[PDB]
Amino acid sequence: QALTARFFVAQPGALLIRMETGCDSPRHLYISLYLLGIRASNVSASTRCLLESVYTASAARAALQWLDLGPHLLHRRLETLGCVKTVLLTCVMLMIPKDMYLTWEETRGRLQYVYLIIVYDYDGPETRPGIYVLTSSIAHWQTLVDVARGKFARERCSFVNRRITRPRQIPLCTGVIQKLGWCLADDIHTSFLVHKELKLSVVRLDNFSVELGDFREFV
Amino acid sequence: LAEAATDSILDNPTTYTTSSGAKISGVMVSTANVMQIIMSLLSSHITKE
Amino acid sequence: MENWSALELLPKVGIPTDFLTHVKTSAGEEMFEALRIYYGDDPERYNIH
Amino acid sequence: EANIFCTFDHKLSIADVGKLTKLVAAVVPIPQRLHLIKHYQLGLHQFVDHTRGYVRLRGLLRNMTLTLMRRVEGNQILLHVPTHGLLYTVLNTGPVTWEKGDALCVLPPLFHGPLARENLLTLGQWELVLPWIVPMPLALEINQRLLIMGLFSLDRSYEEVKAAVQQLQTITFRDATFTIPDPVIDQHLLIDMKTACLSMSMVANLASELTMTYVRKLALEDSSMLLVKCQELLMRLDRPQHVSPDDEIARLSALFVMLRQLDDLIREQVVFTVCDVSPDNKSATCIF
Amino acid sequence: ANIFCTFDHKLSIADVGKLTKLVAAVVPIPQRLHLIKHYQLGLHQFVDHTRGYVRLRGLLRNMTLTLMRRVEGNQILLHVPTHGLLYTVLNTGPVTWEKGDALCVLPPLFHGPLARENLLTLGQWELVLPWIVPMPLALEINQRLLIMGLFSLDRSYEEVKAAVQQLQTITFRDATFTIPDPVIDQHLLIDMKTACLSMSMVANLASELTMTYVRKLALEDSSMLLVKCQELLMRLDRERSPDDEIARLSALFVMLRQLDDLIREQVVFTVCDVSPDNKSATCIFKG
Amino acid sequence: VENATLARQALNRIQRSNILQSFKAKMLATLFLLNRTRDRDYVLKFLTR
Amino acid sequence: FFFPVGLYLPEDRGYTTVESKVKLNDTVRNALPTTAYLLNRDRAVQKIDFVDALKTLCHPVLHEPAPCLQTFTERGPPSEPAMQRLLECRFQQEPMGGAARRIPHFYRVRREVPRTVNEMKQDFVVTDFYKVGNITLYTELHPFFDFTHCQENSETVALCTPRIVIGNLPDGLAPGPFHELRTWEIMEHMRLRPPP
Amino acid sequence: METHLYSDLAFEARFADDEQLPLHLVLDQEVLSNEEAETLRYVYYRNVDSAGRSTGRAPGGDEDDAPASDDAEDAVGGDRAFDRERRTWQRACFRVLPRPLELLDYLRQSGLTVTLEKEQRVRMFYAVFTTLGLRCPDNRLSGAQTLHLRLVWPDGSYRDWEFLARDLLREEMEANVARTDEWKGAGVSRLREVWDVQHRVRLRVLWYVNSFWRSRELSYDDHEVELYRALDAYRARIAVEYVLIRAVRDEIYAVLRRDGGALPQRFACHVSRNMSWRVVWELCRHALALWMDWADVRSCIIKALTPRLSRGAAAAAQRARRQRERSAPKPQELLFGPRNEPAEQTWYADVVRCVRAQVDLGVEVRAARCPRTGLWIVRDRRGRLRRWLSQPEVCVLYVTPDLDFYWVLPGGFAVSSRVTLHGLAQRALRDRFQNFEAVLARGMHVEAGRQEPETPRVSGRRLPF
Amino acid sequence: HPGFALTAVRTDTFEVDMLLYSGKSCTSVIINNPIVTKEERDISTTYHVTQNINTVDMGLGYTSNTCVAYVNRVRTDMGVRVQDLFRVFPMNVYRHDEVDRWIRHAAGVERPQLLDTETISMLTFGSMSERNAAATVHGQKAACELILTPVTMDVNYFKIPNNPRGRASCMLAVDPYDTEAATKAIYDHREADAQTFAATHNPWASQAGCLSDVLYNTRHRERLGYNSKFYSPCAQYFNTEEIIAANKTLFKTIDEYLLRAKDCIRGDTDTQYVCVEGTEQLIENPCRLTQEALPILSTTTLALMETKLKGGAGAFATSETHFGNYVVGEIIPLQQSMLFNS
Amino acid sequence: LTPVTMDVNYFKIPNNPRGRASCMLAVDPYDTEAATKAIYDHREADAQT
Amino acid sequence: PILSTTTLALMETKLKGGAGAFATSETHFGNYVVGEIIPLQQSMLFNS
């Protein structure tokens, strides 16, 4: 059930994320999901080094200019658009790296939803985000935020430690949960991909039905 | 196996009668290989009619 | 909970029978779902309401 | 994938299927979401267990999926999962009067009082217990009131808690009466109160120095009834120098998100919203 | 699921010629009836002297909202959207739309304006449409109205007047608005007053209830989050009967439940490709 | 052909395991036909299969 | 299917119904079984021993007698007053420095002490333990724990105490000759079957 | 480690209105059992001053210098003493780590740093962490102010430990960013064991060097006459049950002197003409002396008096007196009104045996009145009959919930009397064994009178999660 | 060899073709004309077409006799690999952490696992913790065991097909609708059992509250932390409430056998996971109806297995005994001449 | 070879001489991790013995 | 597996064997026999 547009910009499995530019002429920018792999801190350093090696542009330097401009405010600029039918390009309003994908079950529930999970660290100098994507079977939001509070207690401790050690600096949240649609339990498969003659470890989701959610802030 | 089963009471003595007066008194169904073992073992009693 | 009066009053079709075990053994050992074993003679089939 | 079949080990009499055919377009939850199911997981009686917690059932029935019963013809019940958006017709057995604007949320069936507890299908070990469909203000009042039962009653004897919750269990909403029987203090209640404590401490710390003194300024200025209520609620323990616009903007943003993560414990996302109620208050045509 | 609407008064040709410009825009209506008189249509029936804007937001949140489709002789083809399928709208909001945002619906803030809806009026009636603004500007201007109302109780001083004059301005992409005060002549509107009162008193109830409930909670299994919670409370403090606490907690919950037109801004649309002049945009109705 | 294995069916684990068991069984047991047995009915049944 | 491993057969009734068909070496790893040999799906020999059995025998659930103690309190005191006679023992606190002189003051009464249930479990042969003439079959519930009913403050309570040694296993269930056969095994494990 | 930080900060908080110090404690297997510590509900404390016997009562004197005087309806000064003694007990912070651990290695693996004079080995099996408060009334602290400490179990049973202030501070008084991270960084000064008063229980106290109590400049003195007054207070608090026992003993001797000893039969056991009774009389004397020897607080009359002290016994005594003071029934209430209705008694017993010199103290017994006669017949709590009235080598004492009395020699002959608590005051009888009613915590329902689920049971065998 | 001797209990599924025989005109078949149902999909249309069948069995008794005929494929391996008891009770750790790390190192399981909350057991049908290995040359595997007494006479007990718990627990032979006599028959030891006229044959297995009753009873395995997906083959013998529930009349008992008493086991994993709602296969059990189990060919020394494999016809069913060694002779000769005729 | 290795169920049954399974049918298709695990690795057993 | 003794006595008792004696697999004290599963010597040499 395709609902398409045209988006002024090789795999079909990409999530166009519309991030807001601090510069005033574009007012926004369409970054794909793989370039949060370079800002994530849960990821392996080798895959981060590979994506830093392949994708240096002037717009990548402006991307690091305008995402690290305002820290702990990235959820005010985070905005998804759905999946790619073909790559100017189009996007409907699934390729995932191996370490940014995680599951807290035996992933043996038949119908399972997907969920973008981000977290905000504070125990270092300022802020290190960690990008996740959570394939889970829970449908209701409160039970999901209970198991997220159960699985991410150290980030809550870091949140309250930032609120007690830097009183002039105000945080906003500890992260974002947001659904995107569902894949079944059988087409999820550890897999392989080579882009521009490079080895990168990818796990794929095949039968996706796109159905978005909202960026629900939680603690 | 034949004499252990009780006969039914919805009895139709017109249907399922062979030529030369033999009345059918049951059906014995199995797979390919068990039936061909029965045929290769008990071939003397088989009357293909 | 059934209408056994309809079983005892309505006109019936006859059958040749062959039970598996004895009939009273088929009564006391619950082979069917609904049974109405009364000994002697019961006049319960007459109060037509 | 859309129609869910089921079966019983019993057969179905004309009395039982006559009890059941009146329940066309009635809501029945499913724990599993599979194509063919058994009737020993249909409904809710697989999950009911008294002296375990009404709040555990409130957190558990919240997690099941929902279906609508129709087209019964003999060993086929045909639950039908509603698609996201089309107009459906439902039927409620939970005795609450409805309204064209009020949305709906599902609650486990509390006891109503008459010691009827109607189960409408009685088998050898399994009755059929049915989820209540109730309007949104009663759902919010139920959630906030059993959270009051949880949060208020820590470190107290049974006597003053008995005298409080004997009058606090009653909700008189639209000429009815209600009772919240099992508010028992579970680990689920402890993590709910822990999130409530964290959110209350955050909105107590990172709110402004001028929002704390707003009602004090209205006390010094104005006189109303709820102002007298605020003075009796706060007065027992009793020129702006600092101005900062953008810090107040970020402060209200943080106050908003922490109020939202306090409010999430009682406010469920809606499951049905009506377009018409039947005037004898039996069925309704609602969109979800 | 198509709606109709008839006007009782004489309707001219200039009024239709200025109304049919609004061929595809949102018009919220109080009850989903199949035929509705035009007095209920729109938002003119709600505005008055004493009540302000937060009342309009609260009644518009629980109100259903539909789409205007076509015009006829004296029947108006309103059409309620369905969840998931996509439609076209117009832009009555004053901000240029772009791709893929999330539109909100808020009551318009130009009450008694310089545009005056093209003099599309009848006898003691006027049509008015709500703004359709994307979400960051929506909850931004919600915060702006809120802390404009907070400063309103001591405004005799002059630096707070310049602070309010800063708050009255706004910034966006090629967008400057001047959203007027809730205060007019040394008094406040009652729904704005009860909104800021509800949030200030739930803040105070938190400030004098958390110091009880960290001790009434922490005698269970303690955590590092709990000692850091009392650390936060104790830095806040050193910076300086059942019958009462049951009322404190009940008033806590019911007064935080009066901010529900502020704390949750519920998305109603998803933007698709836009038009040149940025007045029209196909979109997906959500919720 | 001893089990339903039409060519569009994709096998799970235990099916392939008993297929391999039967591979080794019918490779060891019936490797050379006419050097082991000179029986009429065995070569008839084998050629029929 | 079911098959036993490691069973010890009685020796006084010992019989060999094969003598010419098989002949073995007299080392006692062959004159006392400890493992079993079975058949696979294909007809092949395979070993089942205690080495694979530590995936079940070394579990924390095997060593908890609290369900056994709860069900022994549930099905609690015995039936007959004829079996109230063998079930009295006391766990008190006596100052032992006084007891070192009070030992002749204990025997100055002339009333007999009844034997407890553990003494009642060793006056049976290995083939009479499994008959209805035996009394203590309602007590032998676990190979790691001894059970009894003993009156503390004059009420019969159930109590489980772990047999910390395997020597505390009763001789109807682990007899003397089996123990000496285990010693012959443990001497052959250290290459000492001729003793010095 | 965790609850020490919280309670230390909370005692920084509440120092303005209640002036106590943070006395952090840990305990071990030398005090409470693993089955007893796995299910431990909540700990309690209330410290006794040198001249005043509590804190929650009035500062100078009290009303508790009046005796109960063997009243019937008001058991011990009514029920105001119940809420008064409940008001003086405070609830303390609490945690149990139910797994084997080395304290120095556990605090080293956690955030703290140990700086001891020497690294001795404390091998303990499970650690329960709690903080109590010794109260400084002025800046001055008294060396005879003792600190009591309860351990409350979910059934309602409790043990009682208490200890003075000389053994808590025998050395640590004679040796004189955020808060949490510096508390973690500097940490614990040292560790020493503290004993109770009766040298029974060895538990350990933890002295943290980042305690704010070091910054209050507390003064201290331990005089001899204050320690002697604390010795007399402890003498009374130990002598309460024992003077009740002596009142029972001279009650039995006086009621034997009164009627001479030609005492009737009050229990249902047969007798034979031929058997001599000089032997059973000498056995009665020897066994009463033996019961005088092995007298203990865990006995029949004390556990019979424990549910007497609460408010429910006062309400049941009022309604039972109103029911037993009721006139002859009239036909007007018999014919139309609600009709009226004490099935079988709930006693306690001490059974003493002369030939084996073993008394058995805590016994429950359900008595019954035999229908054929006016005699008493005892039965077990399960339902079997009690055959100790056959044995000529035994004796048995009895006590009613009416607090009547039966001392029964072999043959069912009972020396009847009543208990005497005229010679005892109120405050010791309350604060020794006042029956405590449970407060709401995890695992229990809101309204009273409900079926209870399983305990929370913070477990040492299961994964605790 | 320690001071106890295990009896092992395993299950063994099969692929079997059973023939059937029914009398003439036994069950009338009632069919109808089919109905079509249109459904609107995105581009194309599916036409659901149904047809109903009613079947009136017109014999008094059972009119159709079937017989298990010919085994061809053995689905499991008939192996010896031990039931992974660490995965079925994932909660229970030892008290001391070092002895638990040392036991998990000396065993195979790498860590204690945390079993999920009950809502995930509602949404997902179960846990299924054990991961399938890379070797599947034998099939799926299961073998569990019962700790017994090492004196236990096999001659009365392990040669003939018998109950592995010691007491006869077949409620066909007891009075129907009598719970007290059933509990007196299968639990009381002041009177002998029915199979052999002795008390028991393994007193750690029969008593209500033994280790077998706290390791296998599904009424009593819920208290300690257990997993509902691993199929214990002894659970058909130790589930006491499931056994006393079948204490009925023999015709309703045989209808329970031919209708209800068929388990399902999932057929794509190498560990026997409990299938939920079998709609593609069904595992019928005669060894739950008869409440016994059959002895498999086991020896103790190699050379006695060699003299079994050296013999021919009529060799797998004898039962020889050396001095301390033994061989239990199987009663069903399926190891001898099922794969021999292949 | 190593001179200890058992022969009673290894050397007299059809078997692979490398020691392990190496059958390549019992593994899942197109899963090289489980392939190289079950041919080479030694934290697990073969499907044969 | 093919026929492989380790002492000549087992080869002699298999060369004196009439029919099917090649199928067995016998073991002495440390001296063994691998028995064939394909009866190859009997078949191919009985065909001569």
Which amino acid type is present at position G76? G
What 3 state SS string does I18-48 have?
EEEEECCCCEEEECCCCEEEEEECCCCEEEE
Q: Which two tokens stand for residue E279?
A: 């007045």
G173: number of Cβ within 10 Å? 24
Q: Rounded to an integer, what is the distance from CA I192 to the centroid of its chain? A: 26
User: DSSP code of H183?
Assistant: H
Residue E154: list chain D partners with CB under 8 A: 217, 239-240
Query: Which chains neighbour I (Cβ–Cβ under 8 Å, 3 or more pairs)?
Result: A, B, C, D, F, G, H, J, K
List of residues 6+ apart from H121 with CB closer than 8 A: H102
Query: Element (H or E) spanning J21, and its range?
Result: none
Nearest C-alpha neighbor of E188 from the set D218, D208, D209: D218
d(CA H91, CA H103) in angstroms, rounded, equals: 25
Task: Name which of D92, D68, D65, D91 is nearest D79 in CA terms.
Answer: D68
Q: Is the dihedral of CA G35, G39, G40, G45 positive or negative?
A: positive
**Apex CA C19: angle with CA C17 and CA C21, to 5°?**
155
Q: Report the first-to-last Cα separation within chain B, whole angstroms.
A: 22
Q: Please give the Cα distance from H166 to H168 (Å, whole number).
A: 6
F41 and I CB contact within 8 Å: no
Question: Counting beta carbons within 10 angstroms of the beta carbon of residue H298, is it exposed (0 to 12), middle (13 to 18) or buried (19 or more)?
Answer: exposed
**Cα distance between residue B38 and residue A168, in whole Å:** 92
Q: How far apart (Å, rounded) are the C-alpha atoms in residues D231 and D210?
A: 18
Q: What six digits make up the tokens of I42? A: 């995105």
Cβ contact (<8 Å) for K34 and J13?
A: no
F18 touches chain I (CB under 8 A): yes
Residue A191 phi/psi, 5-degree rounding, is: -150, -160
CB-based contact H174:H4 (threshold 8 Å): no
Residue D159's identity, in one-letter code, is E
At A113, give phi and psi (nearest 5°): -90, 165
In chain I, residues with a C-beta closer than 8 Å to the C-beta of A135 are none
Q: Which H helix or E strand runs over A116?
A: strand A112-121
Rg (CA), chain B: 13
The partner residue sitting opposite I251, judged by closest CB among C18, C19, C30, is C30
What SS3 class is residue D275? Answer: strand
Residue H59, chain I, CB below 8 Å: the answer is no
Give me the residues paired with residue A130 across strands: A119
Return all residues near E233 (Cβ < 8 A) that are at least 6 apart. D201, D204, D205, E210, E211, E214
| Alpha carbon distances (Å) from H266 to H234, H252, H406 | 40, 16, 8
CA-CA distance, D178 to I271, in Å (whole number)? 50
Cβ atoms of H25 and H131 within 8 Å: the answer is yes
Helix and strand element counts for chain E (H, E): 8, 12
The rounded distance, in Å, linking the Cα atoms of I55 and D156 is: 66
**CA triple D89-D91-D95, angle to 5 deg:** 145
Q: How many CA atoms lie within 13 A of H222 on its CB side?
A: 13
User: Which of 270-289 (I) contact F at CB < 8 A?
Assistant: 270
From A85, H259, A117, G59, select the one nearest I106 (Cα to Cα). G59
Chains F and H touch (3+ CB pairs under 8 A): no
**Which pair of structure tokens corresponds to residue H414?**
């009972």
C-alpha dihedral sign at E233, E238, E239, E240: positive
Sheet of strand A15-19: strand arrangement: A29-31, A15-19, A80-83
Which chain I residues touch A109 with a CB distance below 8 Å? 120, 123-125
Burial of I280 (0-12, 13-18, 19+ CB in 10 A): exposed
Residue with tokens 């093209």: E118
Helix H or strand E encompassing G62: none
Count other C-beta atoms under 10 Å from residue E254's C-beta. Answer: 14
Strand partners, A199: A194
Closest-CA residue to G137 (of I216, I208, I182): I208
Q: Are I276 and I125 in contact (CB under 8 A)?
A: yes
**Nearest alpha-carbon partner for H456 in H442, H445, H439, H446:** H442
Rounded to a whole number of angstroms, the distance from the CA of G44 to the nearest CA of chain I is 10
The minimal CB distance from C29 to the residues I60, I62, I250 is found for: I250
Q: Chains G, H in contact: 3+ Cβ pairs under 8 A?
A: yes
Rounded Cα–Cα distance for residues H37 and H457 (Å): 9
Q: Which of H437, H445, H453 sits opposite D157 (nearest CB)?
A: H437
Q: How many CA atoms lie within 13 A of H400 on its CB side?
A: 14
- Is there an interface between I and E (3+ Cβ pairs < 8 A)? no
Nearest of I341, I338, I335, I342 to residue I309 by alpha carbon? I335
Whether the CB-CB separation of G71 and I208 falls below 8 Å is answered with yes
Q: Is H147 helix (H, G, I), strand (E, B) or coil?
A: strand
The identity of residue D158, as a single letter, is Y
CA H355 to chain centre: 32
Which of B46, B2, C13 is CA-nearest to residue I24? B2
> What contacts H338, CB < 8 A, 6 or more positions away?
none
CB-CB contact of H209 with H182 (8 Å): no
Whether the Cβ atoms of residue E281 and residue E97 lie closer than 8 Å to each other: yes
Question: Distance (Å) from the C-alpha of residue A164 to the closest C-alpha of chain D?
Answer: 10
Tokens 């008015």, located at residue: E128
Radius of gyration of chain A measured on its C-alpha atoms: 17
**Apex CA H351: angle with CA H349 and CA H356, to 5°?**
165
Tell whether I249 is within 8 A of chain C (Cβ).
Answer: yes
Residue type, A60: A
Size of interface I-K (CB pairs under 8 A): 9
Least CB–CB distance from I137: residue in J8, J26, J35: J26
A175 backbone φψ class: left, alpha, beta (φ>0; ψ -120 to 50): left
> Whole-angstrom Cα distance, residue B2 to residue D7?
35
CA distances for H363 relative to E198, F6, H300, H347, H349, angstroms: 62, 78, 7, 9, 5
Angle in degrees, CA H25, H28, H34, rounded to 5: 130
CB H411 within 8 A of CB H389: yes
Question: Which of H78, G9, G163 minimizes the C-alpha distance to I5?
Answer: G9
Residue D128 contacts residue D121 (beta carbons within 8 Å)? yes
What is the C-alpha to C-alpha distance for residues A44 and C1, in angstroms, rounded to an integer? 73
SS3 I253: helix
* Strand partners for I61: none
Residue pair I74/I138 in contact by the 8 Å Cβ criterion: no
Q: Reduced to 3 DSSP states, what percent helix, strand and coil does chain G have, rounded to the nearest 5? A: 25, 15, 60
> What's the N-to-C CA distance of chain G in angstroms?
47
As given in the structure block, the two tokens for residue I22 are: 């029914």
* Residue ranges of F 1-49 with Cβ closer than 8 A to chain G: 21, 24-25
Is residue H48 helix, strand or coil?
strand
Chain B interface, best mutation among C12, C18, C19, C31, by max B CB count within 10 A: C18
**Strand pairing partners for E89?**
E281
Distance CA K38, CA F7 (A): 32
Question: CA dist D138 to D132, D141, D178, E257, I149, Å?
Answer: 11, 5, 10, 13, 64
> CA D142, CA D155: separation in Å to the nearest integer?
23
**Strand ranges for D108-212 from DSSP E:** 132-135
C-alpha separations of H456 from H39, H464, I220 in Å: 7, 10, 19
Q: D269 vs A143: CB contact, 8 Å cut-off?
A: no
Query: Is the separation of the CB atoms in D52 and D182 below 8 Å?
Result: yes
Taking contacts as CB-CB distances below 8 angstroms, the residues of chain C near I60 are 17-20, 26
Q: Which two tokens stand for residue D90?
A: 């439902």
Q: Which amino acid is at A102?
A: L
Among the partner-chain residues C19, C29, C30, the one whose CB lies closest to the CB of I60 is C19
The residue written with tokens 């203090």 in the block is: D185
Measured at the CA of A119, the angle between CA A115 and CA A123, to 5 degrees, comes to 165
Encoded tokens for G91: 């766990």
Distance in Å, alpha carbon of K40 to nearest chain I alpha carbon: 18
Subunits touching J (CB < 8 Å, at least 3 pairs)? F, G, I, K
Question: Is there a contact between K31 and I303 (Cβ–Cβ < 8 Å)?
Answer: no
Discontinuities in chain E (C→N > 2.5 Å), after residue: 240
Please provide residue I14's backbone torsions phi and psi, each rounded to the nearest 5 degrees: -145, 160
Instruction: Quote the minimal CA–CA distance from D205 to chain E in Å.
Output: 6
Q: Does D242 touch chain E (CB under 8 A)?
A: no
Task: Please name the residue of chain G whose CA is at the shortest distance from the CA of residue F26.
Answer: G42
CB E203 within 8 A of CB D255: yes
Sheet holding D103-107, edge to edge: D87-91, D283-287, D272-277, D103-107, D132-135
Breaks (C–N over 2.5 Å) after residues, chain J: none
Tokens of E45: 């029936």
Q: Does I73 touch chain F (CB under 8 A)?
A: yes
Chains that touch F (3 or more CB pairs under 8 A): B, G, I, J, K
C touches which chains (3+ CB pairs under 8 A)?
B, I
AA identity, residue A108: R
- For helices D187-205 and D54-61, what crossing angle results, to 10°? 80
Long-range pairs, E163-166, Cβ under 8 A, ≥24: E163/D243, E163/D245, E166/D245
Q: Are C5 and C44 in contact (CB under 8 A)?
A: yes
Percent helix, strand and coil across chain A, each rounded to 5? 25, 30, 50
> Alpha-carbon distance B10 to I27, whole Å?
8
Method: cryo-EM
Residue with tokens 């302000």: E52
Structure tokens at G97: 């420095």
Amino acid at H287: A
Query: Which tokens hold the place of A173?
Result: 């949240």
**H405: Cβ–Cβ under 8 A, 6 or more apart, which residues?**
H248, H251, H398, H399, H415, H416, H417, H418, H419
Q: Are F31 and K38 within 8 A, CB to CB?
A: yes
Q: Which residue has the tokens 């059809």?
A: J14
Task: Give CA–CA dist K29/I11, Å, rounded.
Answer: 37
Q: Please name the member of E86, E98, E231 whose beta carbon is closest to the beta carbon of A164.
A: E231
Q: What's the rounded Cα separation, in Å, for the pair E171 and E175?
A: 6
Cβ atoms of residues G169 and I203 within 8 Å: no
Measured in angstroms, the resolution is 4.0
Nearest C-alpha neighbor of H280 from the set H406, H418, H390, H417: H390
Contact between I317 and I324 under an 8 Å Cβ cutoff? The reply is: no
Contact (Cβ atoms closer than 8 angstroms) between residue D28 and residue D79: yes
